[PDB]
Structure 1
Amino acid sequence: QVERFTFQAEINQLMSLIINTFYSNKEVFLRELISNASDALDKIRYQSLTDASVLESKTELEIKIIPDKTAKTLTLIDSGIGMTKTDMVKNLGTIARSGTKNFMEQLQSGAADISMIGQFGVGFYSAYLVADTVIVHSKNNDDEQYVWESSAGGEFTIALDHTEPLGRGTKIVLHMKEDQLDYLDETKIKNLVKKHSEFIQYPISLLTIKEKEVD
């Protein structure tokens, strides 16, 4: 079963602005997504300080990053608190803070910059600086694994996830744009992850997939 939702008006503007207009430091997306991953890890960790049984679904607190040149995807997986179905609609389809709604006017006027999008809990959408389509798989202890998809257009979808179980956490899949495929190159992404994760307290693994014909 697939359930359709409309983005809240501001989110469409934020997304239109991100997609339609232009920015020069697209690499901030990685910083934002790694920061979200760390936040989620912080959340489950803080829960485990009062109740260590929350960690049972997946004991490792870590981030995994997988560039796939063949699939043209960059995937980021964290074992954070994950999102329930309601959490997904809220966190990926709405703006909560009224302060964030004002910031959208300072951003749209050009006074504010894309790189500060994270200070208002919307750094996620910076993924559309490099990806035409973004898939989010998420699993929270108090609910089932759901999968969230959007390619903008004023709408997103959510379904029960039947792909590989996460145990607990969030998997974001960016279907890269053709012009932004070098983010899947080993040296590029390694240095960018190193740069944008210096203060992150969690381990971060970078996967490299090499393919050679036998001869």
Structure 2
Amino acid sequence: MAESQVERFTFQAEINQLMSLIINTFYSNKEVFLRELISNASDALDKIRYQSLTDASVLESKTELEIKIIPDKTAKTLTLIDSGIGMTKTDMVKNLGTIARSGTKNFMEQLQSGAADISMIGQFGVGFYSAYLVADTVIVHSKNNDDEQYVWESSAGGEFTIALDHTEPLGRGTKIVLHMKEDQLDYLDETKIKNLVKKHSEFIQYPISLLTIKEK
């Protein structure tokens, strides 16, 4: 018998509206989600790398600076792991949905006016929410040197939860798990995801491993 305390939070109103706009509108090309996942991993890796220049001890929790991308058709998941800075519990509450910058309202306005298309979401400071183009549920496991490992989860609908994480220890970094929508399962096809990772990583300075999971 296991026990966990789970904390439930409400999304900021504009973030809720944005998630609704991302989920309930048709977009012909959703590949930006993968660009944004990889972008966030790279930024997290840069942050810990630069921290290490001024204090080498920050890397002791995990010496490797790398990205792993794991399509799993059986599980209907795409997982992206980085060994970057990671997020504390408070970092996840603040960065993943309780605070909204002015980018949110302006992005929704520009989507509706035609000034911006969905592929431009990262420029408005809300790139993370692009995951909901292709995923019904997003799970973010993260470990920062300053906290225990936590897991954030949301299926949208106005709420997210955060709990102490009892799954595989990361050492340091973030493991984002996208539970893919049925009509978006093609993004788990090995050749398709391999080639898109190539397309969306030309400028990425960290090693990327693609690990395709086959069941039995």
Establish whether TM, by shorter chain, passes 0.5: yes
Cα distance in 1 between the residues matched to 2:91 and 2:100:
12
Cα offset, 1:13, TM superposition: 1.1
166-175 vs 88-97, which moves further:
88-97
170-179 vs 110-119, which moves further:
110-119
Q: What is the identity percentage for the equivalent residue pairs of Structure 1 and Structure 2? A: 100
1:27 to 1:66, Cα distance in 2 relative to 1, 3 A: same
Secondary structure at 2:130 match in 1: helix
Cα offset, 1:116, TM superposition: 1.0
Cα offset, 1:104, TM superposition: 3.2
Cα offset, 1:95, TM superposition: 4.0
**Do the aligned residues in 2 keep the contact of 1:10 with 1:104 (CA within 8 Å)?**
no
Matched, 1:53 2:62: no
Secondary structure at 2:54 match in 1: coil
74-83 vs 105-114, which moves further:
105-114
> Aligned ranges for residues 106-185 of structure 1 at < 5 Å?
106-185=110-189
Q: Report the RMSD for the aligned CA atoms in angstroms.
A: 1.3
**Do the aligned residues in 1 keep the contact of 2:10 with 2:98 (CA within 8 Å)?**
no
Q: Which runs of 5+ in 2 are unaligned?
A: none
Deviations 1:158-197 (A, max 9, x none): 0000100000000000001111111111100000000001
1:194 to 1:35, Cα distance in 2 relative to 1, 3 A: same
Cα distance in 1 between the residues matched to 2:51 and 2:27:
38
Cα offset, 1:111, TM superposition: 2.5
Cα distance in 2 between the residues matched to 1:107 and 1:151:
22
Partner residue of 1:27? 31
Deviations 1:35-82 (A, max 9, x none): 000000010011001011000000000000011111110000000100
Cα distance in 2 between the residues matched to 1:192 and 1:181:
14
Number of residue pairs aligned between Structure 1 and Structure 2? 212
Matched, 1:197 2:207: no
Cα offset, 1:203, TM superposition: 0.4
Cα offset, 1:99, TM superposition: 4.2
- TM-score w.r.t. length of structure 1: 0.94
Partner residue of 1:78? 82
Cα distance in 1 between the residues matched to 2:175 and 2:192:
21
129-138 vs 98-107, which moves further:
98-107
Deviations 1:83-124 (A, max 9, x none): 011110111113443344433322344422111111122111
Secondary structure at 1:144 match in 2: coil
**Do the aligned residues in 2 keep the contact of 1:135 with 1:173 (CA within 8 Å)?**
yes
